[PDB]
Design an enzyme around this catalytic site. Sequence first.
Site, PDB file in Angstrom:
ATOM      1  N   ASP A   1       9.156   3.428  88.697  1.00  0.00           N
ATOM      2  CA  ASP A   1       9.205   3.933  87.328  1.00  0.00           C
ATOM      3  C   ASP A   1       9.296   2.533  86.470  1.00  0.00           C
ATOM      4  O   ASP A   1      10.348   1.885  86.609  1.00  0.00           O
ATOM      5  CB  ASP A   1      10.157   4.885  87.289  1.00  0.00           C
ATOM      6  CG  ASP A   1      10.431   5.334  85.573  1.00  0.00           C
ATOM      7  OD1 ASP A   1       9.448   5.145  84.983  1.00  0.00           O
ATOM      8  OD2 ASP A   1      11.656   5.619  85.518  1.00  0.00           O
TER       9      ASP A   1
ATOM     10  N   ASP B   1       4.086   2.706  81.216  1.00  0.00           N
ATOM     11  CA  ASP B   1       5.299   3.359  81.967  1.00  0.00           C
ATOM     12  C   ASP B   1       4.696   4.149  82.946  1.00  0.00           C
ATOM     13  O   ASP B   1       4.274   5.216  82.771  1.00  0.00           O
ATOM     14  CB  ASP B   1       5.897   4.278  81.071  1.00  0.00           C
ATOM     15  CG  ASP B   1       7.371   4.955  81.529  1.00  0.00           C
ATOM     16  OD1 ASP B   1       7.685   4.851  82.811  1.00  0.00           O
ATOM     17  OD2 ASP B   1       8.325   5.380  80.873  1.00  0.00           O
TER      18      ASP B   1
HETATM   19  C1  LIG Z   1      11.492   6.340  82.109  1.00  0.00           C
HETATM   20  N1  LIG Z   1      10.065   6.568  82.764  1.00  0.00           N
HETATM   21  C2  LIG Z   1       9.458   7.981  82.254  1.00  0.00           C
HETATM   22  C3  LIG Z   1       9.980   9.094  82.871  1.00  0.00           C
HETATM   23  C4  LIG Z   1      10.391   8.627  84.445  1.00  0.00           C
HETATM   24  C5  LIG Z   1      10.804  10.244  85.017  1.00  0.00           C
HETATM   25  C6  LIG Z   1      11.274   9.686  86.657  1.00  0.00           C
HETATM   26  C7  LIG Z   1      11.814  10.928  87.307  1.00  0.00           C
HETATM   27  C8  LIG Z   1      12.797  11.859  86.569  1.00  0.00           C
HETATM   28  O1  LIG Z   1      12.214  11.994  85.337  1.00  0.00           O
HETATM   29  C9  LIG Z   1      12.050  10.683  84.713  1.00  0.00           C
HETATM   30  N2  LIG Z   1       8.835  10.119  82.956  1.00  0.00           N
HETATM   31  C10 LIG Z   1       9.069  11.120  81.957  1.00  0.00           C
HETATM   32  O2  LIG Z   1       9.691  10.742  80.884  1.00  0.00           O
HETATM   33  N3  LIG Z   1       8.193  11.935  82.218  1.00  0.00           N
HETATM   34  C11 LIG Z   1       8.185  13.066  81.185  1.00  0.00           C
HETATM   35  C12 LIG Z   1       8.955  14.308  81.717  1.00  0.00           C
HETATM   36  C13 LIG Z   1       8.337  14.528  83.079  1.00  0.00           C
HETATM   37  C14 LIG Z   1       8.221  13.273  84.261  1.00  0.00           C
HETATM   38  C15 LIG Z   1       7.493  13.821  85.485  1.00  0.00           C
HETATM   39  O3  LIG Z   1       7.885  12.620  86.421  1.00  0.00           O
HETATM   40  C16 LIG Z   1       6.818  12.551  87.347  1.00  0.00           C
HETATM   41  C17 LIG Z   1       7.045  11.239  87.957  1.00  0.00           C
HETATM   42  N4  LIG Z   1       6.489  10.287  87.010  1.00  0.00           N
HETATM   43  C18 LIG Z   1       5.147   9.854  87.306  1.00  0.00           C
HETATM   44  O4  LIG Z   1       4.743  10.088  88.687  1.00  0.00           O
HETATM   45  O5  LIG Z   1       4.241   9.243  86.774  1.00  0.00           O
HETATM   46  C19 LIG Z   1       3.139   8.953  87.102  1.00  0.00           C
HETATM   47  C20 LIG Z   1       8.286  14.626  86.201  1.00  0.00           C
HETATM   48  C21 LIG Z   1       7.814  16.157  86.114  1.00  0.00           C
HETATM   49  C22 LIG Z   1       8.336  17.272  86.947  1.00  0.00           C
HETATM   50  C23 LIG Z   1       9.745  16.813  87.412  1.00  0.00           C
HETATM   51  C24 LIG Z   1      10.308  15.731  87.281  1.00  0.00           C
HETATM   52 CL1  LIG Z   1      12.033  15.400  87.761  1.00  0.00          CL
HETATM   53  C25 LIG Z   1       9.818  14.615  86.620  1.00  0.00           C
HETATM   54  C26 LIG Z   1       7.414  12.339  83.384  1.00  0.00           C
END
Ligand SMILES: CNC[C@H](C[C@H]1CCCOC1)NC(=O)N1CCC[C@@H]([C@@H](OCCNC(=O)OC)c2cccc(Cl)c2)C1
Length: 337
Positions: A35, A223
């Site tokens: 991330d 990101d």
């Molecule tokens: C700070 N960077 C952005 C953040 C990072 C995430 C890391 C894990 C915990 O959450 C935060 N991502 C987001 O804000 N997202 C929007 C909501 C869903 C996230 C989505 O993350 C999949 C991993 N991201 C991926 O594969 O990118 C290619 C997700 C979907 C379902 C369940 C969970 Cl717990 C998380 C993506």
Amino acid sequence: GNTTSSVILTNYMDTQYYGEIGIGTPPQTFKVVFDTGSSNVWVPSSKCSRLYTACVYHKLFDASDSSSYKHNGTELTLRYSTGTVSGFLSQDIITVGGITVTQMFGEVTEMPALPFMLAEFDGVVGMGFIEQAIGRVTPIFDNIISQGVLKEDVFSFYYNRDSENSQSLGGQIVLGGSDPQHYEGNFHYINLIKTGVWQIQMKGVSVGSSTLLCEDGCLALVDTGASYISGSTSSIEKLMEALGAKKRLFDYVVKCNEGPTLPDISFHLGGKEYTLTSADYVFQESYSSKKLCTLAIHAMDIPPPTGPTWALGATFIRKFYTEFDRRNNRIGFALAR
Ligand SMILES: CNC[C@H](C[C@H]1CCCOC1)NC(=O)N1CCC[C@@H]([C@@H](OCCNC(=O)OC)c2cccc(Cl)c2)C1
Ligand SMILES: *[C@@H]1O[C@H](CO)[C@@H](O[C@@H]2O[C@H](CO)[C@@H](O)[C@H](O)[C@H]2NC(C)=O)[C@H](O)[C@H]1NC(C)=O
Ligand SMILES: [Cl-]
Ligand SMILES: [Cl-]
Ligand SMILES: [Cl-]
Ligand SMILES: [Cl-]
């Protein structure tokens, strides 16, 4: 120093990409998202109560089965857009690739069902800067750089498009370099605004021919932990109107038959136009005019000091191979293949 490690990534439905790391000796493997929008490493802990059904459903780190484990127990709380995890700090050796480094990470003992019951991965390996690390824990890539093993002080991301193939690689992260098997041409490098955040300036976003959005400049976070492209509620409302999209509870949709003839969306970065067509951004599950198809774009109001900002997540990175260059504080993009 001439090593470049490489971790294969599994691609789940174009929304989660994760690879494996091993922690401890012998290694306990974990599925983790790499991330760039965060800076801490964590995995669920064997000490996580069953009361947390997300700890029931993921791999747990058991400190007492590793000889290289070094106790710390300082409390840690991490807040993401999706919710909050909490636990305490532990030291152990972590293998990614390739590379073995000693690291401080979070053992998580509170993991909410929302939304980790939907996580196909176990934990997170933050790739951002120490400036954004909670507890100011030295981030994994900083610890690796300190080893002087890497060819160049960079890492890069290839994310593929989901596939029906048994084979066909979900994605790949390279440490130390980039992999010309997955991009064509050369990198166009854009300079970070400042060290501390994988964030560059953005001069405009256009829909069709017209400069609809960010007309006077705005920021873009790059990101790799974000599934979709994101903008502020105010930009996204505008963009979604332009496309005739409908806001539902979890997504924005269009009639599936309309997707293919939707306007291109271009992002104006470092003097160039980065265009994703409607094939890059509609999940076309059918082309029926009686079905609704999800866009890979949504609103996220990212609060100061890091926002207001767009974030260019997997929807974008799928099209553009991305190299994160810590030596020169810049980001390079080239066409993925
Ligand atoms: C700070 N960077 C952005 C953040 C990072 C995430 C890391 C894990 C915990 O959450 C935060 N991502 C987001 O804000 N997202 C929007 C909501 C869903 C996230 C989505 O993350 C999949 C991993 N991201 C991926 O594969 O990118 C290619 C997700 C979907 C379902 C369940 C969970 Cl717990 C998380 C993506
Ligand atoms: C657990 O981690 C904490 C966080 O660094 C350590 O506390 C630091 O210890 C150093 C060295 O003694 C001190 O200089 C700092 O004042 C401490 N920092 C903070 C924020 O309190 C602690 O020593 C670690 N414990 C073990 C045994 O690893
Ligand atoms: Cl955080
Ligand atoms: Cl909800
Ligand atoms: Cl705007
Ligand atoms: Cl897509």
